[PDB]
């Protein structure tokens, strides 16, 4: 079980760790998060009390280094940093542990929610979407635009999601215009799965990461990416049976976790109605359709 210590908490802030959240008061003697499960990526995220504008945070994996948080009064935010001195870090954490100022990652033993939301998400792939190679962790915030959004302005600060565009030469084989547009199996299986992602696990990992950035930071381009990757599968007549079954599980847990009150902005009516009721895969997502109908029947 790993730990992310905090030097201090100088400004009032809501701190998130994965799907959990704590409101920390200005100068509240508080010194980090312990008992973080090993084996998963994690996200630590922040919303200041004085400016609910800009949610921001850091994706990390404690197996890759010892990380801590420290507020920077010049740049005005909580920054993740790596401690290279391992004895210094163990000593800090142990002192913080004896002062009972570290919250315990509050996972219920029965609860597989985080695993189910991050099953295919890998740090190495996050770091290719979010390019900042000198750090082992990755910063994301509400305002960052995607490579595709920029095409339609700072590239260093972009989300380099895989570009999906249904009316593009990549998606449409010359001479199969109608066939490829109405049945996107070629684009899914040959261009994207075999060509770009190599396997379905990497595809699902990017889909899951896009959802999580949409949910935790309200990142609009991430939401667009999540829905495009759903729609590409649902609009393919020929999808491996194992992928459809896994997609249903992925989406079930995403819909289950979404805040009831954010459904209006994070769910695209057209895509979901098309995917559940018109698409080739309209009858292949039983778990997802049942939770959507019982939780968000207005959208449908």
């Amino acid at each position: 079980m790993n730990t992310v210590p905090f030097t201090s908490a100088p400004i009032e802030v809501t701190i998130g760790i994965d799907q959990y959240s704590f409101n920390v008061k200005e100068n509240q003697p508080f010194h980090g998060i312990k008992d973080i499960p090993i084996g998963h990526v994690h996200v630590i995220h922040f919303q200041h009390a004085d400016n609910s504008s800009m949610r921001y945070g850091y994706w990390f994996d404690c197996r890759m280094g010892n990380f801590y948080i420290q507020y920077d009064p010049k740049d005005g935010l909580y920054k993740m940093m790596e401690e290279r001195d391992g004895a210094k870090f163990e000593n800090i954490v142990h002192n913080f542990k004896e002062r009972q100022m570290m919250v315990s990652y509050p996972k219920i033993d029965e609860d597989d929610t985080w695993y189910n939301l991050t099953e295919f998400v890998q740090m190495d792939k996050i770091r290719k979407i979010v390019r900042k190679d000198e750090n082992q962790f990755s910063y994301v915030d509400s305002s960052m635009t995607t490579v595709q959004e920029n095409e339609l302005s700072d590239p260093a600060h972009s989300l380099n999601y895989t570009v999906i565009n249904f009316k593009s030469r990549e998606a449409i084989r010359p001479g199969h215009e109608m066939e490829d547009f109405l049945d996107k199996s070629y684009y899914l299986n040959t261009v994207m799965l075999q060509g770009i992602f190599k396997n379905s696990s990497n595809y699902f990992g990017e889909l899951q990461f896009a959802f999580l950035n949409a949910m935790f930071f309200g990142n609009y381009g991430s939401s667009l990416q999540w829905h495009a990757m759903i729609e590409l599968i649902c609009s393919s007549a020929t999808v491996p049976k194992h992928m459809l079954d896994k997609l249903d599980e992925i989406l079930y847990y995403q819909i289950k976790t979404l805040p009831e009150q954010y459904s209006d902005i994070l769910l695209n009516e057209r895509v979901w109605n098309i995917c559940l009721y018109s698409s080739f895969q309209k009858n292949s997502l039983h778990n997802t359709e049942k939770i959507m109908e019982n939780k968000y029947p207005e959208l449908l």
């Binding site: 009316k167 449409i172 215009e177």
Partner: protein, 237 residues
């Protein structure tokens, strides 16, 4: 964006553009079977592709053999239309290719956009105008060449005859749309108006009769009367 009353004169500027109307591509007769069920029989159709500045009409005849063994024909018809328009564009020299293509029905937007991906600089636009190009098959010479075709065929016409020698392309298009609107609202009456006077003939190389300027004003007035009337007869006013 969409073409409407407000940007109407853009049709007659010097940027090459084409209207595409697909309403006569897939045509059927509906009939009873011996078992008393209903079936359709396709008849030849046509794509109506028109340069509104010059009057050049590219009439691609759609022979019924293109539907053989195909399903969802009304959907296929939009894609076939887009395939043929894309082929026409590719067949034209670069300096004759259009800078915009305006589709008369919004369901043509995605089929045409997809077929024209190789031409990113050609704008594909809808329109808010209710243009009467479906009535093109009420022009006898156009209907005749479509119905006689035994194979796919492209036939070239100038739908303005020689009008542009005497009037502008704005006025020629207004005359065309008035004639077609009339033929669509009451074909028999419209055609009676156009031919009542046997001394006015249609030249072999023309579609419409050889009216004088003064006779066109009378004709045009008669077509307005017809349309307002039918509008009464239809709504009772």
């Amino acid at each position: 964006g969409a073409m409407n009353s407000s940007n109407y004169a853009e049709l007659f500027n010097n940027d090459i553009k084409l209207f595409v109307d697909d309403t006569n591509v897939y045509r059927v007769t509906v009939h009873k079977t011996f078992e008393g069920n209903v079936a359709t029989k396709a008849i030849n159709g046509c794509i109506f592709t028109l340069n509104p500045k010059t009057g050049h009409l590219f009439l691609k005849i759609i022979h019924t053999s293109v539907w053989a063994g195909q399903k969802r024909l009304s959907q296929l018809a939009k894609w076939k239309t887009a395939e043929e328009v894309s082929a026409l564009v590719r067949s034209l020299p670069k300096e004759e290719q259009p800078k915009q293509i305006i589709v008369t029905r919004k369901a043509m937007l995605d089929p045409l956009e997809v077929h024209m991906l190789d031409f990113p600089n050609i704008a594909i636009r809808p329109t808010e105008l209710r243009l009467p190009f479906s009535a093109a098959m009420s022009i006898d010479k156009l209907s005749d060449v479509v119905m006689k075709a035994t194979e796919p065929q492209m036939v070239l016409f100038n739908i303005y005859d020689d009008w542009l020698d005497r009037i502008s392309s704005y006025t020629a298009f207004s005359r065309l749309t008035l004639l077609l609107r009339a033929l669509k609202t009451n074909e028999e009456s419209a055609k009676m108006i156009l031919l009542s006077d046997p001394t006015i003939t249609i030249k072999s190389y023309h579609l419409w009769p050889s009216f004088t300027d003064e006779q066109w004003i009378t004709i045009e007035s008669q077509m307005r009367d017809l349309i307002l009337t039918e509008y009464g007869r239809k709504y009772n006013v």
